[PDB]
Amino acid sequence: GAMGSMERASLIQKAKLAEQAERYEDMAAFMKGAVEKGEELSCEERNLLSVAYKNVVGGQRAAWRVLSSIEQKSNGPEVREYREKVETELQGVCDTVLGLLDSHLIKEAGDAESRVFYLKMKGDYYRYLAEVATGDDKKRIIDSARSAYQEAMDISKKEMPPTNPIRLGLALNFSVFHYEIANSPEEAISLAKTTFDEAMADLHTLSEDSYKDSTLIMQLLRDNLTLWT
Amino acid sequence: GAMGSMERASLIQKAKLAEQAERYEDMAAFMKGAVEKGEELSCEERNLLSVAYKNVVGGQRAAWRVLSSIEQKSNGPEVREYREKVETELQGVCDTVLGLLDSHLIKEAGDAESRVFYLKMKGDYYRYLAEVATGDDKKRIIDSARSAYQEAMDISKKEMPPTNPIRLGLALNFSVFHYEIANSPEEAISLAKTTFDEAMADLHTLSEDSYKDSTLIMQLLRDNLTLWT
Amino acid sequence: QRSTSTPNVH
Amino acid sequence: QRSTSTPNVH
Numbered sequence: 001g002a003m004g005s006m007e008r009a010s011l012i013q014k015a016k017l018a019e020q021a022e023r024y025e026d027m028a029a030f031m032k033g034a035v036e037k038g039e040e041l042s043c044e045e046r047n048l049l050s051v052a053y054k055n056v057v058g059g060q061r062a063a064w065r066v067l068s069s070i071e072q073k074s075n076g077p078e079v080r081e082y083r084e085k086v087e088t089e090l091q092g093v094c095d096t097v098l099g100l101l102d103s104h105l106i107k108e109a110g111d112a113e114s115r116v117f118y119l120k121m122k123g124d125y126y127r128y129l130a131e132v133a134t135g136d137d138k139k140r141i142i143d144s145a146r147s148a149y150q151e152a153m154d155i156s157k158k159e160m161p162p163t164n165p166i167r168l169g170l171a172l173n174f175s176v177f178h179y180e181i182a183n184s185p186e187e188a189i190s191l192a193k194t195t196f197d198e199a200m201a202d203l204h205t206l207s208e209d210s211y212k213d214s215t216l217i218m219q220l221l222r223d224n225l226t227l228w229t
Numbered sequence: 230g231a232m233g234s235m236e237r238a239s240l241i242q243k244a245k246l247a248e249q250a251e252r253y254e255d256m257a258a259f260m261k262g263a264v265e266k267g268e269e270l271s272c273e274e275r276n277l278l279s280v281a282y283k284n285v286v287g288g289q290r291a292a293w294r295v296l297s298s299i300e301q302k303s304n305g306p307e308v309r310e311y312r313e314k315v316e317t318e319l320q321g322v323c324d325t326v327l328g329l330l331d332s333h334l335i336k337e338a339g340d341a342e343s344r345v346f347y348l349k350m351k352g353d354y355y356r357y358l359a360e361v362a363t364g365d366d367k368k369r370i371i372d373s374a375r376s377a378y379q380e381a382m383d384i385s386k387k388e389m390p391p392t393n394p395i396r397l398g399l400a401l402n403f404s405v406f407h408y409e410i411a412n413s414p415e416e417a418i419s420l421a422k423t424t425f426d427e428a429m430a431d432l433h434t435l436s437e438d439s440y441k442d443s444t445l446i447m448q449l450l451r452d453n454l455t456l457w458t
Numbered sequence: 459q460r461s462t463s464t465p466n467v468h
Numbered sequence: 469q470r471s472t473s474t475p476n477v478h
């Protein structure tokens with residue numbers, strides 16, 4: 001790769017500069033290079049990887065939705081062509097994330113935090129592919145997303161407290177999957193309500209170093225329930 | 230170029246979709262393709278070209294300034310290396326704009342509006358190069374900027390009313406050049422004050438289709454004077 | 459109004 | 469506080 005000659009520590013250092021500069025493609029490239037060194041990522045580095053690629057794919061999703069709306073409201077080839085161009089780029093980024101996850105990041109080893117986070121990430125980027133899929137791809141993409149989320153859920157309930165931010169964020173994203181991709185509003189509402197209530201019931205498990213993240217997700221769970229009720 | 234096979238009208242149409250999508254690199258690529266068809270640009274198309282490239286180079290300038298600040302406050306090679314990488318990309322975009330201006334857009338013909346706008350644009354992108362230049366390049370870049378601005382100023386005073394938005398925007402940007410690149414705060418303040426006062430004196434020349442743009446620039450002239458006094 | 463997923467933080 | 473140049477519009 002293009003980062004092959006750079007030292008891992010310099011790659012991490014430059015990902016953090018790129019974040020400060022709001023250069024999120026660069027930041028994603030630097031973090032990809034870091035991952036390709038073959039060593040496990042720390043919690044801080046997993047955040048860099050997550051923040052970089054989510055920012056990249058987020059801009060592509062927002063663009064795709066704008067163009068898709070124009071495309072359907074006009075129901076010339078230009079809008080469809082340009083929508084397909086953004087769509088192909090988005091799929092290319094999701095393929096890159098999913099390839100890093102399978103080639104390098106997901107393992108049977110490592111602690112449960114890391115294993116859950118990568119399976120949640122795998123579920124997310126299959127979900128992003130599913131937002132733009134149609135046919136024999138779409139059915140199988142949704143199953144790959146649900147499969148990855150479910151394995152992450154099983155591990156998280158067994159190994160992490162109910163306020164853990166990866167656990168919460170995973171459960172929040174699985175439920176959005178249920179409501180938006182799987183069209184199962186009841187399965188979504190059941191997961192979100194259970195997740196929030198169990199977090200409340202074991203509120204004492206909040207961690208000094210992540211409680212702000214936990215309470216943010218709990219609120220986002222409440223917001224989704226209000227939307228869905 | 231990559232846009233060579235696409236019809237000019239489709240290029241314009243897609244630049245407008247890309248603007249709506251906030252895909253400003255795409256938008257700039259589409260507008261470059263449009264320009265390369267060899268026909269003059271309308272006022273609306275000149276706006277698309279301007280909006281696209283300014284957005285691209287604006288993000289690069291903001292990134293460069295963040296990294297430059299980190300670089301100097303730390304006074305390892307990583308910050309300098311990454312700052313040079315952004316710097317090279319910025320120079321590459323400015324070279325692209327300046328090449329379109331010289332190869333295609335600036336002519337002795339066309340109305341004065343178009344001629345002034347392209348010379349102002351030429352002045353701007355030399356100014357962006359000057360923000361990151363140092364030696365035997367820096368002296369000559371500043372002269373190329375001042376030269377392009379001055380020719381634009383001469384034409385604008387002869388052919389356009391003192392409230393015309395290109396005239397105002399040019400004068401605003403020439404004065405920022407004086408204050409920030411040429412270090413001539415008096416020459417800047419003299420230009421800004423004169424420009425605002427002459428606009429006020431001939432306030433009746435505001436155009437129905439651009440008066441909001443005119444009054445915006447007049448206010449920005451006032452803001453700069455308050456900063457500089 | 460769309461569903462809210464996990465945001466970026468830190 | 470930096471000098472303000474022409475903004476993007478329209």
Ligand SMILES: *CC(=O)NCC1CCN(S(=O)(=O)c2ccc(Br)cc2)CC1
Nearest residue numbers: 043046047050165166169213216465467
């Ligand atoms: C420590 C660690 O393993 N990684 C840091 C991770 C950042 C991203 N996730 S998350 O996407 O689950 C998440 C949860 C909550 C918030 Br407010 C933001 C992101 C958490 C662990």
Ligand SMILES: *CC(=O)NCC1CCN(S(=O)(=O)c2ccc(Br)cc2)CC1
Nearest residue numbers: 272275276279394395398442445475477
């Ligand atoms: C009609 C025409 O020739 N072009 C539209 C141009 C857009 C960009 N310029 S400008 O950069 O001078 C400018 C002036 C004022 C504002 Br609020 C924004 C941009 C004007 C003409």
Ligand SMILES: [Cl-]
Nearest residue numbers: 081082085243
């Ligand atoms: Cl296209």
Ligand SMILES: [Cl-]
Nearest residue numbers: 154155158159
């Ligand atoms: Cl387990």
Ligand SMILES: [Cl-]
Nearest residue numbers: 014310311314
């Ligand atoms: Cl670099």
Ligand SMILES: [Cl-]
Nearest residue numbers: 383384387388
């Ligand atoms: Cl003239």
Ligand SMILES: [Mg+2]
Nearest residue numbers: 003004005006
């Ligand atoms: Mg290598």
Ligand SMILES: [Mg+2]
Nearest residue numbers: 006007008037
């Ligand atoms: Mg290394």
Ligand SMILES: [Mg+2]
Nearest residue numbers: 073074075076
């Ligand atoms: Mg119709």
Ligand SMILES: [Mg+2]
Nearest residue numbers: 080083084087
């Ligand atoms: Mg398609």
Ligand SMILES: [Mg+2]
Nearest residue numbers: 232233234235
């Ligand atoms: Mg051609």
Ligand SMILES: [Mg+2]
Nearest residue numbers: 235236237266
């Ligand atoms: Mg053509």
Ligand SMILES: [Mg+2]
Nearest residue numbers: 302303304305
């Ligand atoms: Mg020191």
Ligand SMILES: [Mg+2]
Nearest residue numbers: 309312313316
């Ligand atoms: Mg350098």
